Amino acid sequence: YEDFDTRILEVRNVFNMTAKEGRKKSVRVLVAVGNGNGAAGFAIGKAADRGDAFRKAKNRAIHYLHYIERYEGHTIFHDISLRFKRTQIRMKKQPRGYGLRCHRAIIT
Amino acid sequence: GDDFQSRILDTPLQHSDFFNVKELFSVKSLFEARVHLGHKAGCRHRFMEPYIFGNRLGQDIIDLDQTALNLQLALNFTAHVAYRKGIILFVSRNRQFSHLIETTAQACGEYAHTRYFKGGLLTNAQLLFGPSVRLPDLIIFLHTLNNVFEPHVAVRDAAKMNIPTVGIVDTNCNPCLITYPIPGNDDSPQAIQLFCKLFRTTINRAKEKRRQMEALHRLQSPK
Amino acid sequence: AGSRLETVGSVFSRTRDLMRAGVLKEKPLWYDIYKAFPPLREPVFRRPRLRYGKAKADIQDIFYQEDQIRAKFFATYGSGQKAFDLFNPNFKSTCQRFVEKYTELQNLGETDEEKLFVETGKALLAEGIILRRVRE
Amino acid sequence: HFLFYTGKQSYYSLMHDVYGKVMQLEKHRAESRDLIGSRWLI
Amino acid sequence: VESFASMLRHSPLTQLGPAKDKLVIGRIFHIVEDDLYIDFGGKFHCVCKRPDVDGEKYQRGTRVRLRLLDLELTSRFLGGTTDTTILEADAVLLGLQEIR
Ligand SMILES: [Mg+2]
């Protein structure tokens, strides 16, 4: 998968209280992958070591590849407004040279 | 050489009924086997109402005209897959028909899994079976519900792996994820026996046609 | 690398997308078959929902015109003492013979239901069928 | 083997044979102690 | 060729009308100890108990007489969204059918 790139979107140090260890820490990583040609996916990997959470999330996301339709290879086909849970996103189709003017995660 | 291989694999797709599966069954044949009998109205699934002819005093009746159309498509698809030497797996958790379905698969030359389905069998196959295990190319669900009246795990797991599924779907079943749903009775022994014969005759015809198709094209190469 | 997303699209559309992306280099063997002989409906996921308010299903109660006659026969004589044989595809029950004769008289032009019910009983009595008018 | 995808092809192949034998005996129709001082294999 | 609509109208099951307290002929196909599994031509079989009288007569293939009650035993329960079904029919075994 040399044509695919992986980017990190969040690294969290959550805690699970245990009788043996008290507060126990794991690394929860959210990553996204894409080949820059319409195919992309995301996954979450959890482990006790950060390096392991990177491997788990990176190889899991390659199994959930969406294909996204791009108008003329540079933009969305039409405006998109949606609510996912309590997060609202309002995307707009723009002409060439407009660039990405979006949340930093959306730019990634 | 290359032309012959193209002829074997590309010619069957230029005919609407290359294997003549239409003759195997008829609306009358299905009605004799009680394939139009569904569960009571209380057990009805919302996505099965398109296929229901009506409610005869509480018992949903399955339109055997839609069943004939859908069965033709499902049998036609199952034949081309068998023609191309794909792996076909019969799946059911109904224990009354466990031995019949395992015997059917053996007669066809294919595979059956009528036992407890292990979580990850298809999504985690390489762990459970080995490094280079080849997964099924088609799964035929004679029963799509498990013994706790829930969808068989392999319906979702076959979609996750992008495997087409031919399933018998009674009035209480969920056909949305079945690629080729066949609306019909799944409980009666005479209905299940009919479907098993149809899938067995169809697969053997498709396998036999491939043998004949290869001999004719192969013979032409020297001749 | 694949698309284990069974709630978006269908197995065929997801396989079409993976090949367009460049991840799936060889067509599956079932692909060309699906392209030529697709199912009637696209196999896409849909979440079942309950009906609310005044939404109702669209299932016709199957009631033929013979049932009006059959209901009377069961109320007046019950089920025929001869047992139903549902394995014989051409079985003729005592009630079905009553409804066949009741129809014949109605074709002649009798308009009174009472006339057709008592005359039919007489005709079957001549045939020798044992009809017991069991109020119990 | 046609029972490969069960994961216990040999256990289920044997349970297939004994269940088919049982069916033929039940359909077709003395002391059963033909062997004594024996145990089932562990 | 007869249509499905005609086949349904002239079907023995359509003639039966309501299946409560009707008399039907069944065939024993499976026996488990003193439990008889009887096919009476419907979707689901019934399961009755071997009568004390003439118990040996009730063997596989033996045709019997029954009094139907339900073709499928189902019931929705408090808080349920669908009817629970036991995939069985209800009938009372009356005795062997006279071969005559
Ligand atoms: Mg069913």
Curated annotation (Swiss-Prot), chain A:
Species: Mus musculus
Protein family per UniProt: Belongs to the universal ribosomal protein uS5 family.
Subcellular location: Mitochondrion
Highest taxon, organism lineage: Eukaryota
Domain S5 DRBM: 4-68
UniProt subunit comment: Component of the mitochondrial ribosome small subunit (28S) which comprises a 12S rRNA and about 30 distinct proteins.
Protein name: Small ribosomal subunit protein uS5m
Curated annotation (Swiss-Prot), chain B:
GO CC entries: mitochondrial inner membrane; mitochondrial small ribosomal subunit; mitochondrion
One of the record's GO molecular function terms: structural constituent of ribosome
Compartments (UniProt record): Mitochondrion
Main localization category: mitochondrion
Any one GO BP annotation for this protein: mitochondrial translation
Similarity remark: Belongs to the universal ribosomal protein uS2 family.
Subunit comment: Component of the mitochondrial ribosome small subunit (28S) which comprises a 12S rRNA and about 30 distinct proteins.
Purpose of the protein: Required for mitoribosome formation and stability, and mitochondrial translation.
Protein name, UniProt field: Small ribosomal subunit protein uS2m
Segment of the intact protein contained: 52 to 274 of 291
UniProtKB/Swiss-Prot annotation, chain C:
One example GO MF annotation: structural constituent of ribosome
Post-translational modification N-acetylalanine, affected residues: 1
List of residues that carry N6-acetyllysine: 101
Subcellular location: Mitochondrion
Presence of keyword Mitochondrion: yes
Domain of life, per lineage: Eukaryota
GO CC aspect terms: mitochondrial inner membrane; mitochondrial small ribosomal subunit; mitochondrion; nuclear membrane
Swiss-Prot/TrEMBL GO biological process terms: mitochondrial translation
Residues found modified as N6-succinyllysine: 82
Keywords: Acetylation, Mitochondrion, Ribonucleoprotein, Ribosomal protein
Family statement: Belongs to the mitochondrion-specific ribosomal protein mS23 family.
Record's subunit section: Component of the mitochondrial ribosome small subunit (28S) which comprises a 12S rRNA and about 30 distinct proteins.
Protein name in the entry: Small ribosomal subunit protein mS23
Full-protein interval shown: 2 to 137 of 177
Swiss-Prot record, chain D:
Compartments where located: Mitochondrion
Domain of life: Eukaryota
The family this protein is said to belong to: Belongs to the universal ribosomal protein uS9 family.
Subunit and interaction comment: Component of the mitochondrial ribosome small subunit (28S) which comprises a 12S rRNA and about 30 distinct proteins.
Protein name, as recorded: Small ribosomal subunit protein uS9m
Species this chain originates from: Mus musculus (Mouse)
Gene field: Mrps9
